[PDB]
Paper text:
Here, we present several cryo-EM structures of the mitochondrial [name] Z complex ([name]/[name]/[name]) bound to different maturation states of mitochondrial tRNAHis, showing the molecular basis for [name]-substrate selection and catalysis. [name] is a purine N1-methyltransferase that acts at position 9 of mt-tRNAs using S-adenosylmethionine (SAM) as a co-substrate. [name] is a moonlighting homotetrameric short-chain dehydrogenase/reductase.
The reconstituted catalytically active [name] Z was incubated to complete turnover and used to determine a cryo-EM structure of the ternary product complex of human [name] Z to an overall resolution of 2.9 Å. In our product complex [name] Z-HS, the discriminator base C73 is positioned in the active site, with its ribose-O3 in the expected position directly after catalysis. Furthermore, the C73 backbone phosphate is wedged between S490, S768, and K700, whereas R728 in the conserved 724-HFSQRY-729 motif clamps the C72 and C73 backbone phosphates. In the mitochondrial [name] Z complex, [name] binds to the mt-[name] T loop and the [name] N-terminal domain through the exosite. The exosite establishes electrostatic interactions with the T loop backbone U55 via K279 and N253. The [name] C-terminal α-helix (α25), which is only present in long-form homologs, contributes further to mitochondrial [name] Z complex formation.
Numbering used by the authors:
A (entry chain F): 92 to 164, 175 to 385
B (entry chain A), C (entry chain B), D (entry chain D), E (entry chain C): 7 to 261
Amino acid sequence: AATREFIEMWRLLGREVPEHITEEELKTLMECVSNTAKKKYLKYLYTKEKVKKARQIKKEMKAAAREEAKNIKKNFLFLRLWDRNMDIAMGWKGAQAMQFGQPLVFDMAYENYMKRKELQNTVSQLLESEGWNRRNVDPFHIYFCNLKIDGALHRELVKRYQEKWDKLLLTSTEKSHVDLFPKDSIIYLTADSPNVMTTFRHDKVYVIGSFVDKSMQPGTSLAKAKRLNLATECLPLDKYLQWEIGNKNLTLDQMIRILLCLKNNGNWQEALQFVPKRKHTGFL
Amino acid sequence: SVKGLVAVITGGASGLGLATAERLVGQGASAVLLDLPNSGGEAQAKKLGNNCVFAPADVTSEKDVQTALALAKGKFGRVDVAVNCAGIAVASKTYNLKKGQTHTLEDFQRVLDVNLMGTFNVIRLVAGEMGQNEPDQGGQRGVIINTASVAAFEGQVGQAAYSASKGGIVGMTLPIARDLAPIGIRVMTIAPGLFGTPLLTSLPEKVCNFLASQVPFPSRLGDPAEYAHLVQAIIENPFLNGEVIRLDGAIRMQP
Amino acid sequence: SVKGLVAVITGGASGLGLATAERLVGQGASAVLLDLPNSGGEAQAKKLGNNCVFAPADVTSEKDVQTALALAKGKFGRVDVAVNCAGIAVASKTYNLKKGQTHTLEDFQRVLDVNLMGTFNVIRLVAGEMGQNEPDQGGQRGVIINTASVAAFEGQVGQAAYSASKGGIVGMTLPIARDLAPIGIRVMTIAPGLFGTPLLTSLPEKVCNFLASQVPFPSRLGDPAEYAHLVQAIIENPFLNGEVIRLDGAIRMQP
Amino acid sequence: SVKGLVAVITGGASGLGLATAERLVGQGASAVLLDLPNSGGEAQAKKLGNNCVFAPADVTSEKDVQTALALAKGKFGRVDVAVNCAGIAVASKTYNLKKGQTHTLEDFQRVLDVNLMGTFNVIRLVAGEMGQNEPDQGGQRGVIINTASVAAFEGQVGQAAYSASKGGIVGMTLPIARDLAPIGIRVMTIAPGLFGTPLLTSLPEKVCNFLASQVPFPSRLGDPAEYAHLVQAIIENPFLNGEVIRLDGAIRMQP
Amino acid sequence: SVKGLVAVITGGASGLGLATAERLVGQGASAVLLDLPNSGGEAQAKKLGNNCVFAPADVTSEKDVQTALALAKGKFGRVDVAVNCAGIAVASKTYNLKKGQTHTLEDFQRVLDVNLMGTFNVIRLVAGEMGQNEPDQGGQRGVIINTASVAAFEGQVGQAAYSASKGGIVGMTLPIARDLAPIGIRVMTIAPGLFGTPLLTSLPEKVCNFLASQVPFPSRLGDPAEYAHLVQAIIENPFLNGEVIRLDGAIRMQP
RNA sequence: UAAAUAUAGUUUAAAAACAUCAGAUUGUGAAUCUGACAACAGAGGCUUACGACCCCUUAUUUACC
Ligand SMILES: *O[C@H]1[C@@H](O)[C@H](n2cnc3c(=O)[nH]c(N)nc32)O[C@@H]1COP(=O)(O)OP(=O)(O)OP(=O)(O)O
Ligand SMILES: C[S@@+](CC[C@H](N)C(=O)[O-])C[C@H]1O[C@@H](n2cnc3c(N)ncnc32)[C@H](O)[C@@H]1O
């Protein structure tokens, strides 16, 4: 193809192009309509290899050091099988969560407003968001709504979870949140909501849009929450925090962590700790 | 052997009761399904053959059970084995501080009538029918098998109502065995764990998969046929009386 | 210590409940006697002093318990301990072939409502009252103590109904303890054996003396004051939860 | 079914072990008697025919058990079932103040060595033999059955040493079941009480007749054949694991 | 009350035994530490005051215990309470298929010698000295408290040796109580869960946090002082005999 | 409207550290092993390249006499 040599010459120009690239990555570069998009995408691949090789050089160093130390070189109550034990313990809590835990909904209706770069990141935060829920004392009953089976988000989640996807203790479905819970008990959280949330109510269902807008798209969730007559709310960031830098749209992992602390009787002092410190110059 | 024996299986139109009826009928015994009119037991009775009949009755009602027992006497002439399998469950916490929800007393009462009171109603009425039987070479007049649950020993969160009823069956197993010992009626209790029954199917499919995987061995939901096999073993063994047998694959249920 | 604690003792007008109230009140705690109007608990509350009050209520009815708990809230402001001592017993064989007598369903229901349903009714309602209490330095909001019986393990002949109700309490002791663990309420069960309660002492000396001699050690009927001592130990010990304590002097019942 | 299965029945020369061998061999299975050289088990093995072999070994010693397992491997090629029935009993009080007699530590150690330590020695050694078995359609590599006693729960005077050894088997049945669950081996325990074995029959005739009448039903000593039937049921049932089954006729021993 | 009583605390140099000594000595009682010579028992006895003495002895050896008990008689003149807290913990899988490792018989034997055999050695020897005491107003000569564990009920993977030894204590607790009931000695057993003993606290704080969260309520490792409180309650309660009490916060150990 | 700023797990400094996901029956350094994901607001340009340089959008914080 004409694109293959297109890259090789860029290698002669030293356009920060990686050494080895799979054909799968080549067609992704094909989709790039602009040279700057190709320039940006290639740099991402280049740093991808740089971290891996630096990772590997520092990795074989670990093996070499450990084996050398070994060459130079009772009564127990429990066997060292802790990692397995915690996984089972979290599973039991997770099973209880889906029978009695408060429903937390992740809305997956934003797939049309996401590029591939942001769609990948959304799954990364979704993995972390669910990870923190599992380790929590009182996990939420996480709901994955509007998750099309053939959609990109569903396919990406399967690859990152592999066989664990079918064993996760969460409800994943194609039906909208309005079809699962009463419309009067649903609060669509969003930074653009004119209403400021003061108290975490345990009888309400909170909807978090699984949307990562690196290219800012204000009001996307508000329009969704206004097309259907659903209440909206926003965190009291300005009320308590001296915001100075950055955007007020927090990450999904931070969002669920903030809600998790609030649901555990924590006050705004503890709950808002998870907001990045670089964004605010103190608390009050 | 169970050849020629007449079994009155409570809640035998589905779940464990139906599995017990299938095995006993296939082994030459005669079964009497005793379930609700809407349980669809009539179709099951026809499928199992002429050795099985359907008795529409409610366990919680003394009159209904008496009619079912009378039907069993007319068709077969005697009652030899009684299996209590009908039961209901509710998943509700005793009290939810966060939601301010308190367990409904009716919900607790409803589970008690069917699981616990219903079991006693069949035990006391069926024991009267077994009294008419003449003692065999071993001096036995009949066998009564109750269906407790592992919740009676360690129950999950929200299983207080179900656990209380099943706890009563375990507690009253030996006293009834002592009560009916002079008349030679054996009372045994089976405490199945996670089985492929409609009671546990109502849970989310992902919950069922995790709970099944937590069984040490075999790592799967209990087959209702396995429960029927244990029921036959209890019937055949004359020295099994006043004991609770846990058929759960060595699984202890965490909260 | 139990100094300043508020305890709601069901069936506190006499028997074990009264003994627990006497010890707790004498130790600085405040007790709320919750018994039937005819139990004469008003006089007992007056005897125990201004720190004890009488709240007439029927445990089997939600309305009566709620009013009684409201009285405790108004008089003392909070509820810290809930001792479930209310209960009655029935003696009747499951089936008497010689006399052709069948255990009527009325008594079995009657004991279940008082011993089993009544205990759960108080547990769920009082747990709401303890929910309002602020967690203490140990994170505990309240303690619930249930009164099972040794018959829940090895009941005697004619105690099938009594064993079933007490067996249920043993069954739901842990599920409720797991249910209320996040709230911070400890649920404990005491399984007393033969105690010198008015009901037991009413029997003729021919049987009462024989039962007293059947206890390995001490070879005498359990003193209700000793039951109160165990209740105080459970209240003071923060690590006692989800367990059934047998206070019977190592005596196992014969048929 | 048990046809084709190879069973290593510890203590199979007489008593419960022999009865298990008789049924399993008669059902098509192969048995390997494992008792002391002077137990006369070779005569019993000859009676049961070619399918049965006698392996003289001492359970308390690792070397002899290994040779016995090797004999089973050579004769039949595999081991599918392990039944532990070897054991001894000592009737000595902990301390008699009237006679000034103190229980000897040698008697206690001897009972533990054979009943408890010997049982674990067979389990750990026989488990390795079953570890080589290819998993069957159900993923099971073998089954282990232990022989606890009712004394583990309701022990009599002078049975402290016997209760301690049998209590360990009941305590350790579930940990081993969890231990061998990944391998695919089921571990079960049977707690027979007052069976017609030579040990019980050795006691005074006046006493044994009295005990035979204390069983609620059947009012007779447990038939060793009945114990064998329960062993077969456990083997056939895939879901019986990590549980203790009381085969005693609903008898709770008294002081 | 415990004022004036002489207590022989086995394994009282650290862990639960030490915590028991502090409370009893602080309440006016006299304690006799019975631990191995290598332990820092001498330092602890001096710190506890003139009411505490250290007797270096090995529980598994009769002679060592006899001298230690004779030391208590010389210093104090009588023995009234005995607490069996000495023990060892060994974790080892019964058989590992992938690793090909089989549980060592020596590991199993040594755990039994200290936890089970050692406990019985003290019980049968102290009863001799408690037999010399004059019965009090209640006819009681002494109190013996044993230290079982939750592993005796549901032991984890690799706890077969520990569970078997603790299971024996739970199994033989009632037989000993029946043996010593005529003498007037009460035998009780405690089964603590996860306690903050030096053995448990030595684990990484990451592991300790997970273990703390495993307890439903309170979600923390058991305080050794809490164990001492139950010991005092058992001593002060004349009607507690032949019963096993789980001081584990309603926790059920998972595999 | 204008001027400085913007790290999509979080910080540091101008690539790392601590975290995240999958697998692990771990003999108590698992304090590890084999993988997954590595985009300094976004888009479009310039240049042999540059995180430089240059326009445009959104967002944040100040000022607007
Ligand atoms: O362009 C600004 C600006 O001229 C003026 N304006 C609004 N807020 C301020 C302020 O705080 N300080 C100053 N010095 N000037 C301010 O109004 C305009 C607002 O722009 P908008 O795009 O929001 O207004 P509109 O919807 O009418 O569209 P447009 O045609 O002006 O772009
Ligand atoms: C990072 S935001 C991005 C989407 C953003 N709401 C938009 O329309 O462009 C992703 C999700 O996190 C939640 N969220 C982010 N910041 C929030 C805030 N400050 N208050 C409440 N919710 C917030 C929103 O519900 C949103 O669905």
